[PDB]
Amino acid sequence: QITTGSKELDKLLQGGIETGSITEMFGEFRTGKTQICHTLAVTCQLPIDRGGGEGKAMYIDTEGTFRPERLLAVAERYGLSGSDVLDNVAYARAFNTDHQTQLLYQASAMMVESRYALLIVDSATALYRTDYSGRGELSARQMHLARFLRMLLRLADEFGVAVVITNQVVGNIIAHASTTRLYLRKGRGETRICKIYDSPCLPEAEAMFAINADGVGDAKD
Amino acid sequence: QITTGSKELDKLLQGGIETGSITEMFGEFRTGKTQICHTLAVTCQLPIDRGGGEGKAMYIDTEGTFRPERLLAVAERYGLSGSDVLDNVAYARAFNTDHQTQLLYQASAMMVESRYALLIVDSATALYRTDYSGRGELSARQMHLARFLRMLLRLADEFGVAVVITNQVVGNIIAHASTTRLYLRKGRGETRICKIYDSPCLPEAEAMFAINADGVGDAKD
Amino acid sequence: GPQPISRLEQCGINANDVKKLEEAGFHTVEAVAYAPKKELINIKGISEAKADKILAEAAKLVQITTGSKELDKLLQGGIETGSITEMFGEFRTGKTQICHTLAVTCQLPIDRGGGEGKAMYIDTEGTFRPERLLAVAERYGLSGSDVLDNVAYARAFNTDHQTQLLYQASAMMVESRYALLIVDSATALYRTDYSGRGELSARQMHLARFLRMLLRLADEFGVAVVITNQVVGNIIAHASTTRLYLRKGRGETRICKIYDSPCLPEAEAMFAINADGVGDAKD
């Protein structure tokens, strides 16, 4: 279980993300999805006794929001070398859905040589809306997403890594792929509310957390 | 005969599922189909004198409700090694009907190298409803389902394993193919009513059981 | 009596159209004759000219014990043979159990409340259990094997197959004396097969024709026609002579009510479902 770095969120998840499964966080823009991704990109490298996976991180960005400086802040938070964190995080921006799926072919071969623990796909559904904007092409983007999800699940079962994809809620296909769905909503200022909206094992429940310069971290009124 | 782990249910089945035949359990959502599947996935590995088949398990999931931790709970219930149970259960999620049937080709070759005793297909009919949703395409999903069932029967007769498929009731072709039809309905709280609705050999009869953290297990008022 | 439709072919209807009428379920010249044009026109492969030739040439030629004493008293002695008796009730009320009991009691001597005739069980729901027939046979001291030998069974896979079995039933019922025809979940296949809303008139037409065939067979062979309806149709009301409403009393004891009969009173009787039998309630 990879620690979220919010204790309340860890309790909500019973200790953190299950590696080897897809966890979906759906919420409005600016809710902190990207911040949570950046935090996990470093916490995954933490020792297992500290709530990490002791593995490298993979950030596939589709929205431009990738910030190595946020990774440095999280690394200094947990007392990890920021330079080694950036050296253990391979980054690439997907320009389209086809490029988004094509990066998985390189990911599968690259993930064999080194131990990784986290794969991040940020605005995973945005490219299926910007690229495929017509109505007759909806089935095509659904097929491409289905294939993308199958490759993700295969890599997850193959390498035992955590698969994190982000969805903006301004599809039913994601339901089957994600194991745990988390709903994020804004509390004013920088403090965010997290809710569990489906889990066969985890209760429906809520936890309050904040977004701090160092971290994604518990709410401190 | 693979023990259900509910004594009353074992009596209902005259000792448990017949291996080498398809047993269908149709019921509403949340009736416990998935829980029974998870329980059987472990009980199959139990000794034959304990109601098992002394074989490995195969879980083909279509609904996302698969929890290895539930398998661990069932294993600790019967005093089986949870880690060895997970090592003796090969699992794969079918995203659609074509992938669901395609997994049987890998299953037939893989089932030759190791002894298996149970094949589970959970929400087996759900993908035929989500994929084929139109009315003109009904014959296509019926043909695909027919071929899938024939492959299941062939594999059952070939390897002598138990074939378990789950059906959500929100086809008449399955009637001839399934040997034992079980109707599941909710009793309030966590206690479920089971009824036998066709068997040429087993009586039409009912048994009350409960869903417990460890197990699918007899009702204990 | 009947005027089997074979004679219609000698009037000069071609034999293929007579075969289409038999497939549709019309087996007598009486059957084709007293129906309007639209019934024959709706049959596949029949034009208006063939229907007019058929109607024109056709006009030229043309108590079984329930085994519950209280229920027998409710019915004044048992089912009238030669008529349709409908028992509508909730699921698990014992409709199938009553069917299994009657399937054996029909073979009982008339002095014992039987019809001294063989039974016909058409199942659509899988609930057919020969062991229940064996239990009823041993209850009345009848050979269970001979009971099963005097009960012909067939599972209908669809509505068309449900009606198609009547074609074999009519010809088979001529060689041997039968007394009871059972159709269990008779309306279930009209709900599972015809599930859409635009196809409702089609299932209603098929059901109407099926019911007319039931009445025709009842008047032809003087046998009892028993059909079961699950109430989770008003057309059966005019066709059925006696409507029985079944409801559950808790445990295994069931309440029976008569909900229409021009001759039988509206009244109620309590009965139970016992391993041997459908049999009177014994608190």
B90: which 2 tokens? 């090969």
Which amino acid is present at B153?
L
User: How would you classify the pairing of strands A22-27 and A178-186?
Assistant: parallel
Residue B176's closest chain C neighbor by CA?
A: C157
Are the CB atoms for A57 and A42 separated by under 8 Å? yes
Residue A154's closest chain B neighbor by CA?
A: B92
Per the CB < 8 Å rule, is B64 touching A201?
A: no
For the beta sheet containing C118-123, the strands, ordered from the edge strand earlier in sequence to the opposite edge, are C151-155, C118-123, C178-184, C224-230, C84-89, C242-248, C253-260, C268-273, C278-280
Pick the closest to residue C226 from C101, C106, C113, C83 (CA basis).
C83
Residue B77 marked ligand-binding: no
User: How would you classify the pairing of strands A216-218 and A206-211?
Assistant: antiparallel
Pick the closest to residue B34 from B7, B1, B2, B74 (CA basis).
B74
Per the CB < 8 Å rule, is A200 touching B96?
A: no
| Chain A residues inside the 8 Å CB shell of B34 | 200
Per the CB < 8 Å rule, is A149 touching B96?
A: no
Per the CB < 8 Å rule, is B99 touching A150?
A: yes
Please report the number of interchain residue pairs, chain A to chain B, with beta-carbon separation below 8 angstroms: 26
Q: Which chains touch A (3 or more CB pairs under 8 A)?
A: B
DSSP A187: P
Q: How far is A139 from chain B (nearest CA, A)?
A: 11
Residue B175's closest chain C neighbor by CA?
A: C126
Pick the closest to residue B123 from B57, B31, B212, B195 (CA basis).
B31
Contacts of A102 (CB under 8 A, 6+ apart): none
For the beta sheet containing B180-186, the strands, ordered from the edge strand earlier in sequence to the opposite edge, are B89-93, B56-61, B116-122, B162-168, B22-27, B180-186, B191-198, B206-211, B216-218
Pick the closest to residue B173 from B165, B183, B184 (CA basis).
B165
Q: Provide the resolution (angstroms).
A: 3.7
User: How would you classify the pairing of strands B216-218 and B206-211?
Assistant: antiparallel
Pick the closest to residue C47 from C20, C7, C85 (CA basis).
C20
CA C180 to chain centre: 8
Residues B142 and B131: their CA atoms lie apart, in Å, by 12
C-alpha distances out from residue B133 to A110, A134, A136, B101, Å: 39, 21, 17, 18
**Helix, strand, coil percentages for chain C (3-state, nearest 5):** 45, 20, 35
Per the CB < 8 Å rule, is C127 touching B203?
A: no
Name the residue with tokens 């079995």.
C165
Residues A26 and A146: their CA atoms lie apart, in Å, by 18
Residues C22 and C16: their CA atoms lie apart, in Å, by 10
DSSP B49: G
Burial B58-90 (b: 16+ CB within 10 A, else e): bbbbbbbbbbbebbbbbbebbebebeebbebbb
Please report the number of interchain residue pairs, chain B to chain C, with beta-carbon separation below 8 angstroms: 14
Residues B125 and B121: their CA atoms lie apart, in Å, by 9
End-to-end CA distance of chain A: 27
Residue B61's closest chain A neighbor by CA?
A: A176
Name the residue with tokens 């960005």.
A61
Best residue in A147, A152, A176, A179 for a mutation probing chain B (most B CBs within 10 Å): A176
Q: How far is C142 from chain B (nearest CA, A)?
A: 22
Per the CB < 8 Å rule, is B198 touching C127?
A: yes
Which amino acid is present at A166?
T
Half-sphere exposure of B206 (CA within 13 A, CB side): 10
Which amino acid is present at C101?
T
Burial A10-49 (b: 16+ CB within 10 A, else e): bebbeebbbbbbbbbbbbeeebbbbbbbbbbbbbbbbeee
Are the CB atoms for A193 and A36 separated by under 8 Å? no
Per the CB < 8 Å rule, is B197 touching C127?
A: yes
CA C40 to chain centre: 23
Give C138-147 contacts, CB < 8 A, sequence gap 24+.
C138/C276, C139/C67, C139/C276, C139/C277, C139/C279, C140/C67, C140/C104, C140/C105, C140/C108, C140/C112, C142/C104, C142/C107, C142/C108, C147/C103, C147/C104, C147/C107
Cβ neighbours of C150 (radius 10 Å): 23
| Chain B residues inside the 8 Å CB shell of A179 | 64
